[PDB]
Design a binder for this molecule. Sequence first.
Ligand SMILES: [Mg+2]
Length: 735
Amino acid sequence: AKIIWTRTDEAPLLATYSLKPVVEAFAATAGIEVETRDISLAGRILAQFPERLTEDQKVGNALAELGELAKTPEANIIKLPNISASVPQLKAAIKELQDQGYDIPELPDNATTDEEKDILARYNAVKGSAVNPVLREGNSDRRAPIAVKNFVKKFPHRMGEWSADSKTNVATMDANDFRHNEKSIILDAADEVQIKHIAADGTETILKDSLKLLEGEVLDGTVLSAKALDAFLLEQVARAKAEGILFSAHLKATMMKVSDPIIFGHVVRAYFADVFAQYGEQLLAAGLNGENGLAAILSGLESLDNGEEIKAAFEKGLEDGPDLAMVNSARGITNLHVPSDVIVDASMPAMIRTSGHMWNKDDQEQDTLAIIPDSSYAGVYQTVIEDCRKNGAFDPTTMGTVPNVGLMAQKAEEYGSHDKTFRIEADGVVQVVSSNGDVLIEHDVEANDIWRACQVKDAPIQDWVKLAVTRSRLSGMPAVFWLDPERAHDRNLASLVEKYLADHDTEGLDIQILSPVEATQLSIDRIRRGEDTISVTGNVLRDYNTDLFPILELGTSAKMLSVVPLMAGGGLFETGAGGSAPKHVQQVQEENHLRWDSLGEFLALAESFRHELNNNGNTKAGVLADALDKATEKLLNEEKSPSRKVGEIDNRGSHFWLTKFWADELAAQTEDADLAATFAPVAEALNTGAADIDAALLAVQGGATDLGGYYSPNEEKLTNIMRPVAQFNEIVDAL
Ligand SMILES: [Mg+2]
């Protein structure tokens, strides 16, 4: 079997030249090969223009090849952070590659010829998040790392004290929202449906022409009532003002790129009701409706004859209305300025951790009325708020853990509803018509309403249920499926879950189904008494829960174990969710100190070995994993992660110490005498030379360093820079 270690960009790329050689050496003792595959921005660019490269220049298509491997049982991929190219990065890499002799074309700013359109199309295939779509062939398994969990028990982050008088509460809709208006069905045969809009004029309008559906696929139809929404919003504005608490709105404008910016607009107009009551007609016509935030509005006023007048009306609105949660008080930026500034899954946990407070214009903590329009998930947060007001803040040193098994395969549910979300312009009805004419789903709609369709396939669902059983079985932690009895969609999934659980051996397992609210209560009841509960949820709750609990338990959701059980039985282990940190590379170029933290790679590697143990019966891989777990605990116990300052331990130094501790554990363990015998001399060697190696790894730091490039650094220079201590390299190479 072989593990594929992704060769990426910037910081993690540098770290890879130091860590991968060690991983390969250690993995080999369990009969595991470790190979790199190039998915760097530079490599993916070259992959698009093979016809422009000489035979020796061609790189093939590593990403495409990994996509294929991911569909086979042999897949064991460790995925490190990489660049999701912006136009500037793309342009910069193009130039560097050209300077290196790769005769690739310029990035067309505006395609004005057939050649440019073609070139642009190929470059667009490389821009942005091009990697994840290809590698994530499955559902999500995310857990708080126990090595991290154990550290936090020793050094707990700060949790804001909670008062039983807290006035903080989530405000959400009682009806007429996505949750209550949702209708869901399960196709019993493949079908190519269509979404129509029939007005009162009977005038039927086609919203979505062709939608291919598979047998067993779950399809939902729902609508958000603009009328009920505005009524709700105005009520909350008044309540926040009446109670003297901060008004805040928590949406996900970035991911839900269609529905949420629109809902954000309603929030803005609701807050500045008087302004739009006086200049509505004008403002909306000018496109200044708040869907781009208050900032977009204000800047657009300097384009109107009465801009200064309207601008004063807004300023009056801010002084008269309830105080707003602040994004940046120093710049007067409120919750309402930019739609994407406040993102629900990030903002709610922070507020809960901070005694249920957000910040006012005077940079002071204050209770808040947290508006979450749709009620599908608002109850989860509300349940935690009431619990904290009742029992106090959670205690990181004794609290249990709540992992997540999430349904996300093939843009499952809401995260794939973007091309099926429409802003209703006229009263009437929207219907999903079968290929034969039958009306599968139909909703009464009114101008300004938001109609949405979601879909999730059967295989993803069966795999999700299997993953839940697997995690409960392997961890011994009870699993709870979070399904809302009030949602047609969830009611459909509940029956499928009940059906598919029967395909598994669940004797001895504690598995059940509860509404998101009941599930949250049980989970936090147990967490407070130091017990654990796996949350098995849909896509959105997966996105919320993997932020919520890790932040409460660890103070951050940044250090997580992230696994994607691949379709064909293989595994994808993501080391981190951030970027490839360009500033870290800059520091290496400036003073040869890499502060990139490889903790995520250590964690993912241990799980990768366990994949081999549990799925390919590699017992030696489990021994390697157990020793690596202990080595990581010690690295953290001695605070040997990279320091941010030159002259102090950096990425290379952390690798050495992890390696030393790992060899020690392997030489000390008694499960495999052979492995013990193989590592005894390695540990011995690393130990006598530790003092010299550690000093040498501090000595190399200090001055300017030349990587021979940036997006396409020079192979020989990188190796020389990242593996500078011969004493260490020789111990590793000998293995
Ligand atoms: Mg999230």
